[PDB]
């Protein structure tokens, strides 16, 4: 919200400077986001007089004729060329930023132009390039430098916050301050008021989408241009100036966050009708934009006879034909409070986004309408002529703000802080509010400007804020938590710890985006994503991973392609979605592997990544195995299912060739599961003393039957004094019976409280030798020293 | 066939011993009440064992732990500041000392918890070493109380035992607090008291120490106008009623098929 | 004394937005760009477990948690809750879509303002050394009054960091937890307790801390950008 | 007496003061992962040893050992390792070790020293013969454990 210091200097006249203020205002709760130093005026740009403008024959210039002190020529080509008004001539040789040239004495078509008169967009003072600056023909005496009307200005982009939409008007900022402190000069409404009746009437169709509505009546309008003053103050702020009245309007809006327009009467007929539009009804709006209303889009109507029109789009934009002009001698003024939401989705659905719809969006002093027309009525009398109807049309009576209970020692124990009640009750009635009581709960009823004020809380941070919040000490809670927290954190220290071993072991972490791409679900092969966005940011991530296992072979290509990694071992943790919302834990193996740098014989593959997990998991103490079992996204031949402490978690496995085929990518091993992991509590196994009876065989079985079941059968019934079982050697040819495979198991007994006799393992193998006959399974050797 | 139930590349899988574990369990439950962990030194020079901690010679209290001294050239023991510092070496009996190297080196307030290693002349069985671990805590600053200690120890039963665990504290005798005492845990489990540690407000003398060896130094008084407690509680207790361990010999044997045990452990 | 709880990244626009007092066609809802999630077969829990209605969405913040632990919990306690949290916007260099936040609510009886000023003091102690000092300033939110952002000095980089926001809870947000909360059958809890929290984004600090020029990276998955963190503690 | 709990801004000085017990756990810890066994051997030594093991005489001893075994301080933490591994392959007979260690020595100034030893058939695949140990094999462990930690690692014999 640009805010012209030299302005805002007016309602308090004791500011100390642009930075000083930028201080203020940020402890106030406005934030500024820039400062800048605006109107440089060269000394040559000297204000004129448009004596006569002379249309050059044959072109669409003309030959003004100006009084400049002195009475000089200028050829100019702008629509409001015409005698009159006041211009800003840059006399020959002045150099201006808005043309990066040096202004001289040219000729052009015939006559020679002494200089030249500007626009908005050549003197720098606005963006706005298509026609000369128009001033009072006597704003100045002729040749005078402008600059010596024209002051530089500092302005502030401040920060307004839904909160406080009083705050959308410069005389709300000046109120804040005034309540630090500083002095506050408003503005007051010179107004001679004559009773007469107003040629028009006001009808209300819509009490829902206009709470509250007034109408002014000024006649005898004189639309000339705004006084130098004025002009400079909007220019600054962000607007143009048009006229008199019209600028009056805009002005008086960013005085006080109170959107008026100016209605030309000729175009009212006999009354001004708020009501909701009909279907199609058009409106051409101010932006000279043909527009098609909507049945509930509120609007400003006019009627004459039994005929009702669009006169402008109510709080956001007025139509282009009721607009004032120079011939305008009368108008209705609207000065009213709409309705939020309807303005909210009204501006929205017509792609409009303008200072009236912004302040309706945000709010309106629900009992500032009859104030803000006397503001602007006086204005429209002293720089329009303007004879003014003592009266108003009123429709809407709001009820004035609640009493809210406010106790002082709240404040201060909410605070940590301990202000004196005086200190407090002064602070609120600086903002405006009134304060009744005399302790210790008082009775606090707010200025009908602060929406932001409702509950006590919103009465202590407004003495906070004009204490300082800087004048609130440093503490720190000291209390014994409640039981039921006790505990709390073990699920995220749990995980963290994983993704520590993880880290350590030789896992590198990555970070993938949430989102999937519906195609995936697809070449990935999974079922499709349960969940989608109704606004995605782009098509390839319009729906939530279901599988985290895909984001990492995407990487390992996208690496690959970068850079050209002879390997990885990564591995993410991340949230996944389907059915519910599960953590996940998984990582991708591929690469040449380990081994010696210098030194062929490489460990990788499969077996690398699934003896790295079995790492992992002797290291987090929990039992795993991996049974076979075929998935769609897996390799048929490299694939089984992960099975940690006996209950399956999710899979291990090489990819599928033909996903790899697909994605341009070699043989990619991974795997993938659910946390949080099985938790097993420990069970202290105070080791044996005595030694352990060594122990040896292979087990002979079809090339088909998996290392597991052989082991889990072996191990089920090797007697309950077995120590260790352990696979050294897995052969397979001859002279075995073909099609067969023996499995060197390395076994050990242990008795705790005394040694074993050879006749209690001898016996105690027979029984692993006979069970395992008794399947089908032989045996190539036993009891080897 | 391509199995996939076949052992993988044996690759080795790592742990921590039991200590490890039980010590950080520890710290981080005093963390969490902001205690900052600071270690010593296990060679310490008798002024900072004994001395400093009101702890004079000939005298009955020096009895309570059994010292272990050593002699040899050539050893230079540094004190807070880093500098060079005299004294009749020994192997520290507890980690107390540290609560005065600490404070000469830095001024109140702060919360710390040093743990260590410590030694004491004694047989070696199955509830009792020679060497084991410590935690000592101590709390210096304006205002500081018994309340306070009591606090904290009560905060250390539940982050330890549960929401039905409870703390007891009995007068008893330490020459470096007064008052003093030794305090118990509820372990509702167990359902029996357990004889944790000592711990009381420190003694005027162990400022009064403090800020002599401070000026000594160049250093201006810090303690003059403080107050603060302190406690000293011992691991190897703890990490074997709280991991089944029955020997505690065990700790220190080195041995595999023991230390394997607590790999998964957190 | 902050413990740590995580939070769904899939909400209920009843945790992400009313229960922390910000309306609908609301102003303040603007403050946040929602990502709006369809579908049919998903289950979403609430504190206790149970299952819960609303429009489901990506949490916008991680505030809701905010709401889930105090029906799922007693005063008093410290809290602290990290995670991802998505915006709709443009994914550029020091912008993004993606990002984590990390909360913080302290909730019980006498806590005050001068607490969370405290606490952010001793954030900026432990990030940015003995030189390093806390700034606040008024700002809007619906879930806090007394309000505001909070910016943390950067001695080395000599300049102001606006690190977050935060303020002492709203009265609505009591109220609509223990709402939320009869309607479960659990008693009121809130009722005579205060509570500040605030809430500050990670990918900001970790880049003025690890010299990360460009946001975008850590979603990049790039290996060349990982690995030079390995290191890192 | 009541129960209470303290609240107060540390002083300045005590800042920090925990960053060297960290930094020792954080790498305990990450060596806890990457694969090495964790150990915890006597600080005391046997004088015998600085013979056996060939290390210049320990400069501290006790004026009351428990045992002659026991009467002098470590200076090497790596014997008490390399005989652990005997001490294991006498009750129980494992084929392979990875441990590490990490305490106090004592020589000229006490300083914190970190150690572990290798040993047995090595890392391979349990049915096939392929083996990778020896050297190298901790010669790498270490690289990781470096790599890991961000630092710079070379071995000049
Ligand atoms: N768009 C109008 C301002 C305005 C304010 C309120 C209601 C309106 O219909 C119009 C203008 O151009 O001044
Ligand atoms: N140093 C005592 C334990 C103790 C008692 C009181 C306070 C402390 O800081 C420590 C011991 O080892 O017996
Ligand atoms: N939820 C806010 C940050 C915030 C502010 C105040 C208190 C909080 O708990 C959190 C945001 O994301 O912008």
Redesign the pocket.
Same mark, same amino acid.
């Given at each position: 919200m640009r805010v012209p210091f030299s302005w805002l200097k007016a309602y308090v006249p004791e500011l100390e400077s642009p930075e000083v203020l930028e201080e203020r205002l940020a402890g106030l709760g406005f934030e500024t986001d820039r400062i800048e130093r605006v109107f440089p005026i060269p000394r040559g740009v000297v204000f004129a007089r448009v004596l006569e403008a002379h249309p050059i024959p044959g072109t669409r210039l003309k030959r003004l004729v100006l009084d400049a002190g002195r009475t000089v020529e200028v050829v100019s080509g702008a629509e409001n060329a015409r005698k009159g008004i006041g211009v800003a001539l840059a006399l020959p040789g002045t150099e201006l930023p808005g043309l990066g040239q040096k202004v001289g004495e040219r000729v052009i078509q015939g006559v020679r132009s002494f200089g030249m008169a500007l626009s908005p967009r050549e003197l720098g003072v606005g963006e706005y390039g298509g026609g000369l600056l128009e001033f009072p023909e006597d704003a100045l005496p002729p040749g005078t430098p402008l600059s010596e009307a024209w002051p530089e200005e500092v302005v502030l982009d401040l920060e307004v916050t839904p909160n406080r939409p009083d705050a959308l008007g410069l005389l709300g900022l000046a109120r804040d301050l005034h309540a630090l402190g500083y002095a506050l000069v408003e503005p007051e409404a010179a107004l001679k008021a004559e009773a007469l009746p107003l040629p028009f009437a006001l009808k209300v169709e819509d009490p829902e989408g206009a709470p509250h509505f007034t109408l002014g009546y000024a006649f005898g309008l004189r639309v000339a241009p705004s006084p130098l003053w004025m002009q400079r103050a909007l220019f600054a702020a962000g607007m143009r100036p048009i006229n008199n009245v019209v600028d009056v309007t805009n002005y008086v809006m960013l005085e006080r966050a109170q959107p008026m327009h100016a209605f030309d009467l000729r175009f009212v007929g006999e009354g001004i009708a708020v009501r909701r539009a009909r279907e199609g009804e058009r409106l051409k709006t101010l932006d000279g934009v043909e527009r098609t209303l909507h049945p509930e889009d509120l609007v400003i109507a006019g009627w004459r006879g039994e005929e009702s029109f669009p006169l402008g789009l109510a709080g956001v934009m007025g139509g282009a034909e009721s607009e004032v002009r120079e011939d305008t001698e009368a108008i209705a003024l609207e000065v009213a409070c709409f309705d939020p939401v309807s303005i909210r989705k009204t501006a929205r659905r017509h792609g409009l986004r303008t200072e009236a719809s912004h302040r309706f969006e945000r709010g309106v002093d629900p009992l500032g309408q009859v104030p803000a027309q006397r503001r602007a009525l006086s204005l429209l009398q002293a720089l329009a002529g303007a004879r003014v109807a003592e009266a108003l049309l009123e429709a809407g009576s709001p009820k004035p703000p609640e009493a809210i209970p406010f106790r002082p020692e709240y404040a201060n124990r909410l605070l940590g802080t301990s202000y004196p009640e005086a200190e407090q009750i002064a602070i609120l009635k600086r903002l405006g509010c009134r304060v009744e009581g005399e302790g210790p709960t008082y009775r606090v009823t707010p200025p009908s400007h602060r929406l932001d004020l409702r509950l006590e809380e919103d009465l202590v941070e407004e003495v906070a804020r004009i204490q300082g919040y800087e004048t609130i000490p440093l503490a720190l809670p000291a209390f014994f938590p409640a039981p039921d927290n006790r505990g709390v954190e073990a699920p995220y220290r749990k995980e963290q710890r994983l993704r520590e071993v993880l880290s350590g072991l030789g896992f590198q972490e990555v970070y993938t985006y949430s989102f999937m791409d519906p195609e995936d679900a697809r070449r990935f092969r999974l079922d499709p994503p349960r969940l989608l966005l109704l606004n995605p940011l782009a098509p390839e991530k319009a729906a939530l991973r279901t599988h985290l296992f895909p984001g990492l072979v995407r990487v390992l290509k996208e690496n690959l392609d970068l850079d050209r990694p002879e390997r990885a071992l990564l591995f993410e943790v991340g949230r996944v979605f389907r059915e519910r919302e599960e953590t996940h834990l998984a990582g991708l193996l591929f690469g040449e592997g380990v081994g010696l740098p210098w030194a062929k014989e490489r460990l990788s593959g499969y077996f690398l990544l699934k003896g790295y997990l079995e790492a992992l998991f002797a290291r987090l103490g929990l039992a795993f195995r991996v049974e076979a079992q075929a998935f769609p996204f897996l390799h048929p031949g490299v694939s089984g299912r992960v099975l940690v402490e006996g209950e399956e978690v999710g899979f291990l496995g090489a990819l599928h060739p033909e996903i790899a085929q697909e994605l341009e990518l070699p043989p990619v091993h991974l795997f993938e599961l659910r946390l949080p992991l099985p938790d097993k509590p420990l069970a202290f196994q105070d080791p044996s003393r005595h030694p352990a009876a060594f122990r040896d065989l292979a087990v002979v079985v079809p090339a088909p039957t998996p290392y597991g079941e052989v082991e889990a059968l072996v191990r089920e019934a090797a007697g309950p004094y077995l120590e260790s079982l352990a696979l050294f050697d897995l052969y397979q040819g001859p002279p075995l019976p073909e099609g067969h495979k023996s499995l060197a198991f390395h076994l050990r007994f242990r008795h705790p409280k005394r040694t074993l006799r050879d006749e209690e393992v001898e016996e105690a193998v027979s029984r692993v030798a006979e069970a395992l006959r008794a399947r089908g399974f032989g045996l190539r050797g036993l009891d080897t020293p | 066939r391509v199995d996939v139930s076949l052992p993988g590349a044996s690759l080795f899988s790592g742990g921590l011993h039991p200590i490890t574990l039980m010590e950080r369990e520890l710290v981080e439950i005093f963390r969490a009440l902001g205690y900052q962990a600071v270690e010593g030194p296990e060679v310490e020079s008798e002024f900072f064992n004994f001395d400093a901690?009101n702890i004079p010679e000939h005298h009955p209290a020096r009895d309570?732990?059994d010292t272990f001294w050593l002699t040899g050239e050539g050893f230079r023991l540094e004190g807070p500041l880093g500098e060079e510092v005299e004294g009749r070496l020994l192997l520290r =009996?507890? =980690?107390?000392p540290m609560?005065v190297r600490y404070m000469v080196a830095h001024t109140p307030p702060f919360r710390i918890v040093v743990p260590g290693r410590?030694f004491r002349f004694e047989q070696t069985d199955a509830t009792h070493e020679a060497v084991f671990h410590?935690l000592?805590?101590?709390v210096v600053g304006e205002g500081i109380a018994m309340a306070h200690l009591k606090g904290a120890i009560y905060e250390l039963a539940q982050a330890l035992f549960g929401p039905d665990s409870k703390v007891r504290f009995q007068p008893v005798y330490?020459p470096?607090?007064e008052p #003093?005492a030794?305090f118990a845990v509820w372990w509702p489990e167990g359902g029996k008291w357990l004889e944790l #540690?000592?711990?009381?407000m420190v003694h005027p003398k162990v400022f009064q120490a403090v800020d002599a060896y401070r000026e000594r130094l160049g250093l201006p008084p810090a303690y003059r106008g403080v107050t603060g407690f302190?406690?000293?509680? #011992?691991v190897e207790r703890l990490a074997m009623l709280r991991y089944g361990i029955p020997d505690i010999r065990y700790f220190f044997g080195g041995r595999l098929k023991f230390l394997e045990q607590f790999k998964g452990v957190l």
């Open positions: - | 901690l309570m732990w =009996t507890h =980690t107390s609560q410590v410590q000592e805590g101590l330490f470096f607090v #003093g030794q #540690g000592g711990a009381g302190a406690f000293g509680l #011992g």
